[PDB]
């Protein structure tokens, strides 16, 4: 389907994702905890009944009609976690996730309100701008010809060096600013 590092979904990954989606939609159907716990064991038994199927065409067919079973028996409003996509609190705080570079745009009279914070920020900025050329020359000496096959990034293969393309993963805003 669509994955950052994998080019596809294995049969094992499809079975596990169907199993989790079936349990979540079943818990949406079966609100009470003992009753869901009973039917979740029954559904686990249904998944365990065809676990030892070495015939891959038979297993892919069983996966296909199990997906049909799921698409028939899904809840119309399944439960979604609040910060999960489709949830009631999903991407709520994105208006509070001001990026860090805006701190470069502050007036000095409001940068002087936090002297320790910006004095501690300038060494992060210095660390990033010395790490940058080392991680660029690390990326170009490790990426194959034709470009990178996957979106997987390498770690720092030396000591003292930072991982390549690290700044916006580390300096991302908090979930609750």
């Amino acid at each position: 389907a669509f994955l950052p590092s994998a080019a596809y979904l294995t049969h094992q990954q499809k079975v596990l994702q169907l199993y989790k989606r079936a349990l979540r939609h079943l818990e949406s159907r079966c609100v009470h905890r003992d009753k869901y716990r009973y039917f979740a064991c029954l559904l686990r038994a249904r998944f365990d009944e065809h676990k030892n199927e070495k015939d891959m065409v038979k297993a892919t067919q069983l996966l296909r009609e199990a997906e049909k079973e799921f698409w028939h028996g899904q809840h119309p409003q399944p439960y979604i976690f609040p910060e999960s996509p489709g949830g009631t609190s999903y991407e709520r705080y994105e208006c509070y996730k001001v990026p860090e570079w805006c701190l470069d745009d502050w007036h000095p009279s409001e940068k002087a309100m936090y002297p320790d914070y910006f004095a501690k920020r300038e060494q992060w900025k210095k660390l990033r701008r010395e790490s940058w050329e080392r991680e660029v020359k690390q990326l170009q000496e490790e990426t194959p010809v034709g470009g990178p096959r996957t979106e997987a990034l390498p770690p720092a293969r030396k000591q003292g060096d930072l991982p390549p393309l690290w700044w916006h993963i580390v300096t991302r805003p908090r979930e609750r600013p």
């Binding site: 994998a6 596990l16 199993y19 989790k20 365990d48 999960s84």
Partner: protein
């Protein structure tokens, strides 16, 4: 409201859920107890463990991240990364 999570607290809660799971004995269990290689758990059991983590901490782990959590320490570290603990 909303008490902060610590790595000690997240570790205690993850191991507390795994101790309430009948396919794991509580004395063999540690934070490095690999589910398939040490505890001998099924991949279906790993999916149920990650779903118990979701029902415990109240957020959804995506499946592309769920299928790589194969020890309790990686689960604790993922919850650390997605809740931004030890500020």
């Amino acid at each position: 409201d909303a008490p902060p999570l610590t790595l000690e607290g997240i570790k205690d809660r993850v191991l507390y859920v795994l101790k309430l799971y009948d396919k794991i004995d509580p004395e063999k269990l540690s934070v490095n107890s690999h589910f398939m290689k040490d505890l001998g758990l099924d991949s279906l059991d790993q999916v149920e463990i990650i779903m118990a983590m979701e029902d415990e901490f109240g957020f959804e782990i995506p499946d592309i991240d769920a299928e790589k959590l194969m020890c309790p320490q990686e689960i604790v570290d993922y919850i650390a990364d997605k809740k931004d603990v030890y500020e």
